[PDB]
Design a protein around this nucleic acid. Structure first.
Lengths: 302, 99, 75, 305
DNA sequence: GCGGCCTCGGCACCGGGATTCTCGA
DNA sequence: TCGAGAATCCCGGTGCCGAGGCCGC
């Protein structure tokens, strides 16, 4: 139960038993309780570089001032090798009531020039909560956006004080295509941005990239062509949406896009890269986009 | 020598890399600093009517340089920059034998 | 740097002006004067560097620093 | 030795890298041979950018030649500031019997300062016979802005006149207008060729670029064919477009289905050439993608037909 | 020609210009 | 119906961290 449950989970995950996760179309997530409108709205249109964060040992959402000081005195000491660190519980970035409340880590520089704005969130991540003990407050997702240098310093501090480890979360093109499909399946209005899929062909000498940017309403009507079962999108439906893209690109330019790999799928819901600098959160679906992102972080942790 | 001591101390006082061509000109700045000082101590000690230059002969001069004030006296200025074994000579400690 | 030359300041005070009677630790006061003068030099030269936004102190900033501080440090 | 001139020279002298300091400072002629030895070019960046600008303080540098410094900087760094291609078109008649570089310099500056009264237009007749106009813009309400100039590489008697696509303001229809009225043309048309490599745009718009026994490969009859068809569409030494070769598709999926394809490679026409042999592409590789130089176009706006 | 030093530069995130399209002369 | 104001699509013009160069042991 305290570990052996996780061993059985690892067994289930490694078994790879008929995975196709028929996923519910990201439902309009009415902003739960507090969710500081200024804070969350500041947190939306920021390009979060995802990481996978192992559960934090001996963490508490009461000693935020002590960790703030302990990390502020560490960051400016890494400059010895002007900065304020504000740990801020977000109070609403959680899928179920039992999830740990998401909390921020902002490198505030004089004025509120937030240099780094870290973000640990655990939403709909009850595949990790029910397997880890009480001492660990598990937040699988870590969100950077500040320079990679400051991330590779706060990550070291977190490893030193909490025994949590940051693997840079890399969304594979399979998961990328999945999220590119469930985000054009959403029920949104006033599409903010075009549905762009930045492909990148695997040529050895050259590195040609393709931006198969579709009109966002035109991709919704193309998704409805391959959408038959409502409520949940299947792997076959996602693959048929992606293959309709393939058969509209190889039709035009005679180059098989399916022979290439997704690197970035911009959508009116949320942009999503591969190499880590992934989640822009244009719309307020972020509890669903973050649900997928946390479910993907479990895959890397577990 | 001592000018090289001050240009090296300039490095740990400016907290920022400079040029050597800047340092021989700050050397002329120190040379003229003495060319104003040692005859400013001259004229200030002559103003007190004393041949020698007592510590209060220089406290007035540093009052002229605006570094001694009613808030910042002479001795407090010794705290902030001079090392302990050197300010032991300048500011009077107490052993019932104040220096 | 954590030093203050006893010999050098006395040799300078004797070379430049041959007729004084600087007290037992008066040269230490002269060192304090030069320490604070070079403090003013460093800080106002940092100001001069930010004036032209030069990330290295150069000749054209030191010469401007001199005519302000050296004149200011005159008694 | 002036406002927005001395510091402008400073900002264009830290732009140029250390290796080609002599190369650009020799060509702009303010530093004669005697002046080169005074400054030690090999020491430091802030040292040279301070001593050289002093060497113009004594030389009383003016914006007319400060802009020429920027021109010469870009002549070796033309692979930045992505370039639009303008195509002039005379009607029926004889060619421009009078493109006097003096007259063209007059007929361009006069027309440009007719409306944009405060501009610092600085020409540099290059040795490849192509006047390298640089335009610092600014309306009558403001001073000419040298922060973001619009270099225009007008080939001297050519209908094609490259243009640094800086901001595409209200001056762009005046940039084309002054260009087509200085050189004795009538219609200025943006070719919609937009590439970062001017040395490749020059090639495209002028058509100047092409002038084991055990391993039994079962699909050898197909590899030979795909290699053949990639040699009659991409003949030899393709030029690097390196540009977002857009294809703003408006076609129905087989009412329309809008798309905004953007092929993006450090070297595009070579990346496409190694596509079909790499298995990514079919052998006849969609003339939309092969005829980028053949049509002298990469910013496509295709429809259905 | 290497050791800790430093300097350009691709990638990328944040700041105004002209096109949409709503409202006043 | 039309003219100025605001917002926001399209791409800069900027910020900023790895790569290459370079000078003692």
């Amino acid at each position: 139960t305290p570990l052996q449950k996780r061993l059985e989970s690892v067994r289930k995950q490694s078994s790879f038993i008929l995975t196709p996760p028929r996923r519910k179309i990201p439902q309009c997530s009415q902003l739960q309780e507090d969710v500081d409108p200024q804070k969350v709205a500041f947190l939306l249109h920021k390009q979060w570089t995802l990481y996978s964060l192992t559960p934090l040992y001996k963490f508490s959402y009461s000693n935020l001032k002590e960790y703030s000081r302990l990390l502020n005195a560490f960051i400016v000491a890494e400059k010895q090798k002007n900065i304020k660190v504000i740990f801020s519980t977000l109070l609403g970035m959680k899928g179920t009531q039992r999830d740990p409340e998401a909390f921020l880590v902002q490198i505030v520089s004089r004025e509120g020039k937030v240099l780094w704005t870290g973000w640990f969130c655990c939403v709909f991540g009850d595949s990790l909560l029910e397997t880890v003990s009480e001492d660990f407050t598990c937040l699988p997702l870590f969100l950077a956006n500040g320079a990679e240098s400051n991330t590779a310093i706060i990550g070291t501090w977190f490893q030193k004080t909490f025994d949590c480890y940051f693997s840079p979360l890399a969304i594979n093109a399979f998961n990328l295509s999945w999220m590119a499909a469930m985000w054009t399946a959403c029920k949104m209005d006033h599409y903010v941005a075009t549905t762009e899929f930045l492909w990148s062909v695997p040529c050895s000498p050259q590195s040609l990239d393709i931006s198969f940017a579709i009109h966002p309403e035109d991709a919704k009507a193309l998704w409805d062509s391959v959408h038959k079962t409502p409520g949940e999108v299947t792997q076959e439906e996602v693959d048929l949406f992606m293959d309709c893209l393939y058969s509209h690109f190889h039709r035009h330019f005679k180059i098989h896009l399916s022979a290439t790999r997704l690197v970035r799928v911009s959508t009116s819901v949320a942009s999503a890269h591969t190499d880590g600098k992934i989640k822009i959160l244009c719309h307020k679906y972020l509890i669903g986009v973050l649900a997928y992102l946390t479910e993907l972080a479990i895959f890397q942790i577990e | 020598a001592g000018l090289s001591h001050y240009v090296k101390l300039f490095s740990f006082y400016a907290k920022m890399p400079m040029e050597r061509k800047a340092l021989e000109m700050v050397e002329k700045c120190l040379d003229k600093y003495f060319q104003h000082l040692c005859d400013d101590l001259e004229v200030f000690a002559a103003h007190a009517g004393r041949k020698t230059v007592k510590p209060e002969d220089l406290e007035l001069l540093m009052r002229r340089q605006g570094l001694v004030t009613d808030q910042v006296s002479l001795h407090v200025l010794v705290e902030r920059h001079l090392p302990l074994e050197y300010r032991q000579l300048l500011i009077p400690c107490a052993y019932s034998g104040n220096s | 740097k954590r030093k203050a030359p006893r010999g050098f300041l006395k040799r300078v005070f004797k070379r430049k002006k041959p007729q004084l009677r600087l007290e037992k630790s008066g040269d230490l006061l002269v060192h304090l004067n030069c320490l604070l003068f070079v403090h003013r030099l460093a800080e106002e030269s940092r100001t001069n560097a930010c004036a032209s936004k030069c990330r290295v102190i150069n000749k054209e900033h030191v010469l401007a620093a001199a005519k302000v501080i050296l004149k200011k440090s005159r008694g | 030795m002036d406002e927005t001139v001395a510091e402008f020279i400073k900002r264009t002298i830290l732009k140029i890298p250390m290796n080609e300091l002599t190369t650009i400072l020799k060509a702009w002629d303010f530093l004669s041979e005697n002046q080169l030895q005074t400054v030690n070019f090999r020491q430091r960046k802030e040292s040279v950018v301070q001593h050289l600008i002093h060497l113009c303080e004594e030389k009383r540098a003016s914006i007319s030649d400060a802009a020429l410094l920027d021109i010469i900087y870009m002549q070796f760094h033309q692979h930045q500031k992505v370039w639009e291609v303008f195509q002039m078109s005379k009607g029926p008649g004889e060619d421009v019997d009078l493109f006097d570089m003096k007259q063209f310099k007059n007929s361009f500056k006069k027309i440009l300062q007719r409306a944009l009264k405060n501009v610092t237009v600085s020409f540099r007749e290059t040795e490849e016979n192509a006047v390298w106009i640089r335009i610092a813009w600014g309306t009558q309400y403001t001073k000419p802005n040298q922060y973001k100039p619009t270099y225009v590489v007008y080939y001297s008697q050519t209908p094609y006149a490259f243009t640094s696509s800086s901001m595409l303001r209200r001056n762009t229809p005046l940039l084309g207008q002054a260009l087509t009225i200085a050189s004795k043309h009538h219609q200025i048309v943006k070719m919609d060729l937009r590439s970062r490599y001017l040395d490749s745009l020059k090639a495209i718009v002028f058509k100047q670029y092409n002038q084991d026994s055990r391993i039994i490969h079962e699909n050898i009859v197909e590899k030979e064919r795909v290699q053949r068809i990639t040699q009659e569409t991409f003949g030899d030494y393709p030029q690097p477009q390196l540009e977002f070769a857009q294809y703003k598709l408006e076609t129905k999926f087989k009412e329309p289905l809008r798309c905004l394809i953007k092929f993006s490679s450090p070297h595009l026409l070579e990346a496409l050439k190694s596509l079909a042999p790499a298995g990514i592409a079919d052998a006849p590789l969609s003339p939309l993608l092969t005829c980028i130089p053949n049509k002298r176009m990469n910013y496509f706006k295709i429809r259905d037909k």
